[PDB]
Design a protein around this ligand. Structure first.
Ligand code: SAM
Ligand code: SAM
Ligand code: CA
Ligand code: CA
Lengths: 227, 228
C-alpha cells in the first residue's frame, strides 16, 4: 500500500508516532471519509501529520489548497494555522467538502476556510489580475488534477511570497514512475503517470524554486520560492 | 536494501530526479571523499541532506547544534542553509574524521560558522545548561549519534532549545529492525541498539513537551517541535 519497503514498517509509524497524537476531529473526519466511495483520494494520516507540523514550522498564516475532497488535509492545515489564519480552498466538487465540513466546524476552525466551488485555474487567474494578491500567500497545497500542475505552478509562483512554500501532492504516483511502460497499470495511473514524470523533471530544472521530493504519502514535492 | 522505500529503483529515482541535479558542488565533493573512508556507511544520505538543508531555511534557524558529525555531510548541508552569520555547535568524540571533511567546508565558505568540540556530547550539554544564558537559545538540533543516550540528550536539549524550536533525532527507524521479531537475523550493532530505539520512539510519542513527526527519510528522522 505505502511507498515503504514493508506494510509492517508503515503500520509501525502510524501506530507508534501518528495515531496516538492525531487530533480527535481528524480521527472523526477520517472515519467518515473511509465510508465514502472515493476514500482512496483522502490524505493519509502520516501525511496529514507532516502538513500540520510543516504549517507550524514555517509560521504560515495565509494559505491555499487546490483539491479538497472531504477535507482531511484541509483540516490538518486549519488546525495548525493561527486562530486568525485563512485558507482559500478550491474544488470542483462541493458536496464532498460539505460531507467533511461538520467535523471542521466542530473543531472550531471552519471560520478560517474560504471554500470556492469550481475549477481552480480561473480562480488563480482572477487573483493574479489584482497586484494586491501577488506574493500574498505563505503556503499552497496542490492535490488535484496532475495534468494541470505545470499550469498551477506558473500562477502560484506569482501568488506565493518569496521564501513561501508550495507542496505538490502524489509526485511519486504509486511508484509507477519507475515501472516500465508495459507494466500492468490502471488506466488512470497510466494516464497521469505521463504528466507526473514530466512535472518532476520540470520542477528539478526550475531555478525559481528549491525542491525536496519526500516519500511521505504518495510522494510530496516541497517547492520553496527563491526567485 | 539501499533505503526504507519499497524498491531501490524508486529510491534511485528520487536521487537521480530530484536530489543529485540540485546537490551543491561542495556536498558532492564531501560525499565522494567520504565514500572512500572505511566508515562511509555512517554518512547522511544525499536525500536526507537535501531535506535538512530545506528544513533549516523553512524554520529560519540561525543558531544550531549537531551531535554526531563524522566527516560532516549533514553538518555542511546545515551550514550551507544557515545565514552567513549563523552558527553550529558541532560535537563528536572523533576529531580526525571531522578534519577529513573540513577542507570541503572551508572551500564552501561556511566553515566560520562551526564551533567543533571533540569529546562526548553529554558533558557539553551539561556545561551549557549550567549557565542560564544558554537556556532556550538554540533554534535547531540534529542528533545523529549514540542511541543509548538519545533520551538523555532529549531532556538536556529541551532546556537548550527555544519554544517552537526543533530537534531532529536521526535513524529512528533503524533499518526497519523496529518491526522485526527478536528472533530475526540482524547485524550485531543493529540488535544492540534496537531496544533503545523502540523505547525512544514510544517515549517521544508520549512526551507532551513536544509535537512529533517520524519521517521515512534516510533511516528515519523524528522531528520534535518544542511546545512546552
Ligand atoms: C486527491 S483529491 C484531494 C484530497 C484532499 N487534499 C484530501 O485530503 O482529502 C483531488 C481533488 O481535486 C479535485 N479536482 C480535480 N480537478 C480539479 C480542478 N481542476 N480544480 C479544482 N479541483 C479539482 C477533485 O474534485 C478531488 O476532490
Ligand atoms: C552516524 S555518525 C554521524 C553522521 C553525520 N551526521 C554525517 O552526516 O556524516 C555518528 C557519530 O556520532 C559520534 N558519536 C558516538 N557517540 C558519541 C558521543 N557520545 N558524543 C559525541 N559523538 C558521538 C561518532 O563518533 C560518529 O561520528
Ligand atoms: Ca493526495
Ligand atoms: Ca544518521
Amino acid at each position: 500500500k505505502s511507498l515503504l519497503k514493508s506494510d509492517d514498517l508503515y503500520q509501525y509509524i502510524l501506530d507508534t508516532s501518528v495515531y496516538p497524537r492525531e487530533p480527535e476531529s481528524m480521527k472523526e473526519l477520517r472515519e467518515i471519509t473511509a465510508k465514502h466511495p472515493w476514500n482512496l483520494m483522502t490524505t493519509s494520516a502520516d501525511e496529514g501529520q507532516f502538513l500540520n507540523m510543516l504549517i507550524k514550522l514555517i509560521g504560515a498564516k495565509k494559505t491555499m489548497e487546490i483539491g479538497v475532497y472531504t477535507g482531511y488535509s484541509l483540516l490538518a492545515t486549519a488546525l495548525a494555522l493561527p486562530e486568525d489564519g485563512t485558507i482559500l480552498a478550491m474544488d470542483i466538487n462541493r458536496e464532498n467538502y460539505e460531507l467533511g465540513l461538520p467535523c471542521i466546524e466542530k473543531a472550531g476552525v471552519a471560520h478560517k476556510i474560504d471554500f470556492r466551488e469550481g475549477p481552480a485555474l480561473p480562480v488563480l487567474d482572477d487573483l493574479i489580475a489584482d497586484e494586491k494578491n501577488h506574493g500574498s500567500f505563505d503556503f499552497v497545497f496542490v492535490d488535484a488534477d496532475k495534468d494541470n500542475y505545470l499550469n498551477y505552478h506558473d500562477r502560484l509562483l506569482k501568488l506565493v511570497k518569496l521564501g513561501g512554500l508550495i507542496g505538490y501532492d502524489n509526485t511519486l504516483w504509486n511508484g509507477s514512475v519507475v515501472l516500465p511502460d508495459d507494466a500492468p497499470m490502471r488506466k488512470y495511473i497510466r494516464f497521469y503517470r505521463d504528466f507526473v514524470l514530466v512535472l518532476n523533471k520540470a520542477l528539478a530544472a526550475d531555478e525559481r524554486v528549491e525542491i525536496c521530493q519526500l516519500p511521505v504519502g504518495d510522494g510530496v514535492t516541497l517547492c520553496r520560492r527563491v526567485k
